[PDB]
Amino acid sequence: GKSHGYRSRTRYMFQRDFRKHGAVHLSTYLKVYKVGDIVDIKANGSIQKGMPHKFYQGKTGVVYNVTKSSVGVIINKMVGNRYLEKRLNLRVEHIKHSKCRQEFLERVKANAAKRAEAKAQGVAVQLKRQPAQPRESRIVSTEGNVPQTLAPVPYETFI
């Protein structure tokens, strides 16, 4: 009958990446994690100890604990009509710092900048992001560019 063990269904997902088998490069270990850091989770098939269950593959939580060889990561998983909290004990080989926030951080340090560069000049702040705006008018020229007239084309068979 059925089978639903711990790593069931995980054939290609804990698989190793073409031409990227073997030792993990050492930088994975020189990385340093602190509480509150946002990490992404992705299992390394080659490292069997301290492995995220498949449900947490592709997921992004927050460090809540730092240990000799691991970080504890809290993920909110939603079961029923609701979320519950899960703490995960993960080895550093299955975690990486998330760029999911670099944009923000980039944007804040920049936003504090042009706020000073403004304020202490005589304002004209204007630092919220706006959506792609429609195109303004424009005049397209012809000099060196007269329109070439195209028609549809007859059926044919190449074979």
């Binding site: 706006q130 959506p131 792609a132 705006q133 429609p134």
Partner: protein, 145 residues
């Protein structure tokens, strides 16, 4: 269905103005099968507002019909008249979001001439009624307002 709520279109034939950006353009894309839209002229923004225009005031929905009703609520942002309203809309002003949310969804009747087509629920481009029908939106709305 969610999107039709977010654009405040939750009853057939009702209409609302939408400022165009990538982030609303995609909203429109999601609901082409259920709507008819296009670029409204001055004429038709004007008569939408004069005839069938109502404000949201402690909810309620209050006929315009006097300019003090506007200044009372929109006046904070400039805008102290019914033509001031219209002007904020058509020019997509700096304060379009409040100007436009203030307006209760318009409640049009069915077109008078009719729909012009035997089946509504294909795209305009295929001889139906739905989707961006561009500046032909006015002919329609005017027959519904």
């Amino acid at each position: 269905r969610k999107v039709l709520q977010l654009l405040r279109l939750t009853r057939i034939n009702s209409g609302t103005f939408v400022k165009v950006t990538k982030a609303t353009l995609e909203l429109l894309k999601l609901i082409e099968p259920y709507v008819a839209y296009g670029y409204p002229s001055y004429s038709t923004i004007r008569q939408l507002v004069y005839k069938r225009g109502f404000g949201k005031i402690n909810k309620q929905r209050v006929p315009l019909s006097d300019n003090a009703i506007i200044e009372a609520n929109l006046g904070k942002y400039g805008i102290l008249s019914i033509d001031d309203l219209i002007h904020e809309i058509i020019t997509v002003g700096p304060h379009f979001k409040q100007a436009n949310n203030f307006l209760w969804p318009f409640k049009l009747s069915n077109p008078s001439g009719g729909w012009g087509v035997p089946r509504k629920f294909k795209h305009f481009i295929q001889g139906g009624s739905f989707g961006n029908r561009e500046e032909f939106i006015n002919k329609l709305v005017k027959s519904m307002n």
